[PDB]
């Protein structure tokens, strides 16, 4: 694992081999908007903005993605929830109890099942602002999502309003679903069917589906 | 049914009003390259063209989509051969002879199944010559695909070379599927699985499936 270094916080990046083809783009951008973005309080903080990117991704077949990190408490993994309270990977964790017949759990990590590449569009936000960094973020985050799409094969992006024009963005030929946002109200997350279809669509491909259940913690 | 005019042949288009929304955009676009076209002997003729916009839309779930018509013999409906000759139709209702359990047929029609339209994405190619009107089609078939994918659940298209970036071109949030091409080597298109799949994904989408076997002629 490499390091590159950046003018701002958190001074020093660690990265998997597998983005060097984004780094020095990555460099450039983060030095012309980390002065701005980091005069906020950030959910996560600035050391932990990056460590996602020592994941690697030729491994990865499926993206689940989120706009940005949680309001509060975010950890740098995205979806991450150590003491399991974050509404969103409860709901996803009793979507996937449902589906998988798992039904007595502690909490659950999407960043611990094989295949998958759990990621926050936006690295950061203002604390307590959801989506509050879109502005700062912009460029990197078509920059950093673009390369992930480039190794999965299946985009699995949560919230209508918050990914309406993902495609126009991403200019992307692969599988992109766009499913409910875990939090969207009349209950319409729970109805959704989106972890089911990706296996399905994996199968078609001649990949291996996801096994859902591995990121129960018990 | 409505009818619109273009200054060159066929000069009269009749059109289903599910087509409204893009005909004046066509109309506009057809004339730009109308002259090119036609210079060149067609498949289908230029009054068979545009036979498949009588075609309602709203009742519609599945595309079926080829790269463009027959060298020869293009009728104007997508993947019609009234005689039974033409390679692709045939082995398409090999696949779905496997899949249904008919064995006893005399011809197969994709344009007589509920919920199917079979599509053309260029509209013509010079007579014998494969793709060679791509240029003169280009931004017609993207406006025509484009709309008929507001409307249907799944879009299937045949030919993993000719519609290799076809999510890109698009920006769509249908499901879309890219499988062998009929004609394709080493059995590959016999092992596809994309027409069974079509109904797994249709009723995870919480719609009817097809019945495949109502192409049957008998």
Redesign the interface.
Known sequence: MNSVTVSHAPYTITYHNDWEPVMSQLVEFYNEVASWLLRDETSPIPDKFFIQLKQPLRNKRVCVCGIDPYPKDGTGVPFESPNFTKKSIKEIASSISRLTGVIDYKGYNLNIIDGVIPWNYYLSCKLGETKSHAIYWDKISKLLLQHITKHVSVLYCLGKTDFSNI??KL??????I?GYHPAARDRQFEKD?SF??IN??LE?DNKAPINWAQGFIY
Chains 1, 2 share one sequence.
């Open positions: 495609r126009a200019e992307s030929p692969v599988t992109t766009v069917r089911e279809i399905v669509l078609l």
